[PDB]
């Protein structure tokens, strides 16, 4: 697996930091203190779906109407090869 997203990089790093903070690790030599184990760690470091926005925000408008954007994006993508063909065939003139 390879990381190409920084929020996830940071979150996993944060989990590791919490874990290293949250454990105590015995020596190899011993003296074996009383540990009083936990049955699971998924409970204490639960997978946590993150926030995307607080409930409240102000409105702003842009006059694009949010449907024409999608429509002409569709149009540009489906006619990209032909517009490139037009550009190239006028470019290679003389």
Partner 1 sequence: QQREAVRQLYKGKKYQPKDLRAKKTRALRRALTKFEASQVTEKQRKKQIAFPQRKYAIKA
Q: What sign for the dihedral angle of Cα 16, 20, 21, 23? A: positive
Site string for partner 1, 51-90 (x = CB under 8 A): ----------------------------------------
Report in angstroms how near the CB of residue 11 gets to partner 1 at its nearest. 19
- Residue with Cβ nearer partner 1 (23 or 59): 23
The CA distance from 76 to 82, in Å, is 10
Report in angstroms how near the CB of residue 56 gets to partner 1 at its nearest. 37
The CA distance from 6 to 67, in Å, is 31
The CA distance from 49 to 53, in Å, is 12
Site string for partner 1, 6-45 (x = CB under 8 A): ---------------xxxxxx-x---x--xxxx--x--x-
Are the C-beta atoms of 11 and 17 separated by less than 8 Å? no
Which residues of the shown chain bind partner 1 in the complex (CB under 8 A)?
21-26, 28, 32, 35-38, 41, 44
């Amino acid at each position: 697996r390879q990381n190409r997203n920084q929020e996830i990089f940071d979150a996993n790093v944060q989990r590791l930091k919490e874990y290293q903070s949250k454990i105590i690790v015995f020596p190899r030599n011993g003296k074996a203190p009383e540990a009083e184990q936990v049955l699971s760690a998924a409970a204490t470091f639960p997978i946590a779906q993150p926030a995307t926005d607080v409930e409240a925000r102000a409105v702003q408008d842009n006059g694009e109407s949010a449907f024409r954007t999608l429509r002409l994006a569709r149009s540009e993508k489906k006619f990209r090869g032909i517009r490139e063909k037009r550009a190239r065939e006028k470019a290679e003139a003389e």
